[PDB]
Amino acid sequence: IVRPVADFSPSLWGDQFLSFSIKNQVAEKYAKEIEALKEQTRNMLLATGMKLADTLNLIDTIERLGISYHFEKEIDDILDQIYNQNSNCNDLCTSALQFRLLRQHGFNISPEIFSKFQDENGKFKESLASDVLGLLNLYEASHVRTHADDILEDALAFSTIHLESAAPHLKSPLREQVTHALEQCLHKGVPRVETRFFISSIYDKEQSKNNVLLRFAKLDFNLLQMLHKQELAQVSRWWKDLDFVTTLPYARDRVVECYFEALGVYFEPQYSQARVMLVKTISMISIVDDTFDAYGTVKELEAYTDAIQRWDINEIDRLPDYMKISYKAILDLYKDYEKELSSAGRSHIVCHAIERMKEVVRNYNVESTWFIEGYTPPVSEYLSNALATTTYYYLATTSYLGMKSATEQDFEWLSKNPKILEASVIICRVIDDTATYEVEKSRGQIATGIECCMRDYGISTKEAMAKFQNMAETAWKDINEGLLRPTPVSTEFLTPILNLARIVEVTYIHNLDGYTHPEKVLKPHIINLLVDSIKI
Numbered sequence: 350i351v352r353p354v355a356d357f358s359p360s361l362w363g364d365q366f367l368s369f370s371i372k373n374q375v376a377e378k379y380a381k382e383i384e385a386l387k388e389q390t391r392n393m394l395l396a397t398g399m400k401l402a403d404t405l406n407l408i409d410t411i412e413r414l415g416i417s418y419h420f421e422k423e424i425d426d427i428l429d430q431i432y433n434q435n436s437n438c439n440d441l442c443t444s445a446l447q448f449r450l451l452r453q454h455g456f457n458i459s460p461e462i463f464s465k466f467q468d469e470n471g472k473f474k475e476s477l478a479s480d481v482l483g484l485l486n487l488y489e490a491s492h493v494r495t496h497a498d499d500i501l502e503d504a505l506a507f508s509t510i511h512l513e514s515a516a517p518h519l520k521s522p523l524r525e526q527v528t529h530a531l532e533q534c535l536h537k538g539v540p541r542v543e544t545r546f547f548i549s550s551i552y553d554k555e556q557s558k559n560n561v562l563l564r565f566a567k568l569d570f571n572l573l574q575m576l577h578k579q580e581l582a583q584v585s586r587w588w589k590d591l592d593f594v595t596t597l598p599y600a601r602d603r604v605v606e607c608y609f610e611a612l613g614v615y616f617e618p619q620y621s622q623a624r625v626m627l628v629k630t631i632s633m634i635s636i637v638d639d640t641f642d643a644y645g646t647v648k649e650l651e652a653y654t655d656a657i658q659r660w661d662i663n664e665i666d667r668l669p670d671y672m673k674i675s676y677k678a679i680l681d682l683y684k685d686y687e688k689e690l691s692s693a694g695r696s697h698i699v700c701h702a703i704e705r706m707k708e709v710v711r712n713y714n715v716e717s718t719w720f721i722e723g724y725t726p727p728v729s730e731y732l733s734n735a736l737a738t739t740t741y742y743y744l745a746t747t748s749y750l751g752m753k754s755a756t757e758q759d760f761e762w763l764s765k766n767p768k769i770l771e772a773s774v775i776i777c778r779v780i781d782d783t784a785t786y787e788v789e790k791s792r793g794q795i796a797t798g799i800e801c802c803m804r805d806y807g808i809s810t811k812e813a814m815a816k817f818q819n820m821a822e823t824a825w826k827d828i829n830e831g832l833l834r835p836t837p838v839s840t841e842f843l844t845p846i847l848n849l850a851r852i853v854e855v856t857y858i859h860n861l862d863g864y865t866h867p868e869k870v871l872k873p874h875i876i877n878l879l880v881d882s883i884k885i
């Protein structure tokens with residue numbers, strides 16, 4: 350049997366992550382000062398008689414500095430109270446910020462706060478075009494719209510045109526903040542990435558900066574980075590022992606990239622265990638994808654699918670040699686999962702993640718069949734299979750495994766394919782097909798998402814690409830709507846789904862597969878998040 354040619358580039362990273370020894374003295378020094386700075390920060394938030402604009406600017410700063418995970422109660426109480434006071438404020442800057450912070454935290458504040466800034470048609474008064482800060486905040490707020498927010502239909506285009514016009518003459522670092530926002534808005538960015546940029550390129554360079562807050566953010570970012578470095582070391586050891594880089598040389602070698610993805614789903618230390626489990630699944634399912642996609646044969650892929658469906662060690666002998674590697678590693682990864690959760694009595698929940706992995710594999714197989722036959726389904730039929738081949742129902746289920754508070758009713762909710770999860774899956778799927786379109790019409794892909802769409806509707810490649818853009822916009826409005834209270838589960842179980850959508854946007858920025866081709870988009874992030882500390 351003849352297999353296809355290996356074209357995946359090797360891991361950029363070698364072994365620079367394989368061993369990290371925490372300087373335990375440094376850590377304890379950071380932690381001790383952090384405790385002091387934490388209380389100073391708290392007392393800032395609990396301070397009385399602050400004006401509205403100063404309270405929102407404080408919370409916004411703490412959030413961009415990446416330290417708001419320390420003050421979830423205090424921030425919640427202050428925004429709640431702001432929500433219920435429905436105060437009037439005649440300042441675009443403060444109104445737009447009030448809107449974004451409330452919406453991001455689930456409070457369904459009314460978009461009518463923006464009507465006083467519009468003319469008749471509900472178009473923004475162009476007299477506002479010289480209010481750079483107001484424009485900046487309207488621009489960030491315009492990314493948290495729901496379907497009930499068509500007052501804001503114009504805010505993105507209006508704020509964008511005038512930020513571009515103003516940017517070249519703005520002072521620093523405001524200029525760099527605006528330029529960055531136009532390339533990457535806050536709401537759809539990965540939080541650690543946005544936080545590293547804010548600390549280093551913006552706040553550190555602010556004439557007005559608060560020194561307590563800056564030192565806090567620098568120390569906290571560097572202290573957490575040490576934890577992530579440990580995790581990546583241990584995950585890097587795990588990957589090494591499996592040695593798929595030699596035994597399965599057809600597969601992408603990307604455990605570091607998988608770690609970055611999992612660090613986007615959550616970065617806080619309380620999710621250390623969840624983070625490590627999640628990375629391992631991403632790795633493994635990336636292997637199964639390379640097998641179906643650029644190596645295995647029709648007959649082989651079917652025995653793989655059946656074996657996965659059956660999910661029993663007895664089945665290895667039914668599969669060719671190399672597939673036995675994949676198969677046993679998968680089954681043992683899940684025995685390990687069951688062991689990690691024993692102590693706490695949560696071993697049973699592994700089966701949810703398993704059922705979603707079986708589903709992924711089935712749909713890989715269907716997609717193979719469609720390719721071998723040259724079948725070009727209608728869009729509806731394409732999606733009923735290709736949504737799950739994003740792995741996003743699978744990764745979202747996985748993300749809960751390590752979260753100690755995840756209950757069985759939380760997994761029940763996720764199994765019913767709730768609206769927020771589906772939106773996140775749709776974003777992943779259409780970003781994929783827009784990016785990997787051409788590159789797969791080269792390898793003779795006949796059932797690419799875009800193709801199905803053109804043939805189904807009778808429309809050119811462009812119009813089809815714009816139709817996928819619309820499903821993504823619809824999907825982001827659905828995610829934003831899914832964060833509004835009352836939430837169907839704790840917000841703690843909603844954020845991973847939202848972060849899954851962020852991860853996809855950040856990895857395919859500028860329409861290029863950054864996981865397979867990490868050097869251009871993911872490499873600078875991995876360096877800023879996992880190599881270089883923030884110079885204090």
Ligand SMILES: C/C=C(\C)CC/C=C(\C)CCC=C(C)C
Binds near residue numbers: 610635738781856864
């Ligand atoms: C956008 C396309 C994909 C995501 C492919 C399916 C996912 C993987 C093969 C895991 C690595 C990439 C992540 C963004 C988690």
Ligand SMILES: [Mg+2]
Binds near residue numbers: 638642
């Ligand atoms: Mg694939």
Ligand SMILES: [Mg+2]
Binds near residue numbers: 642
């Ligand atoms: Mg494929």
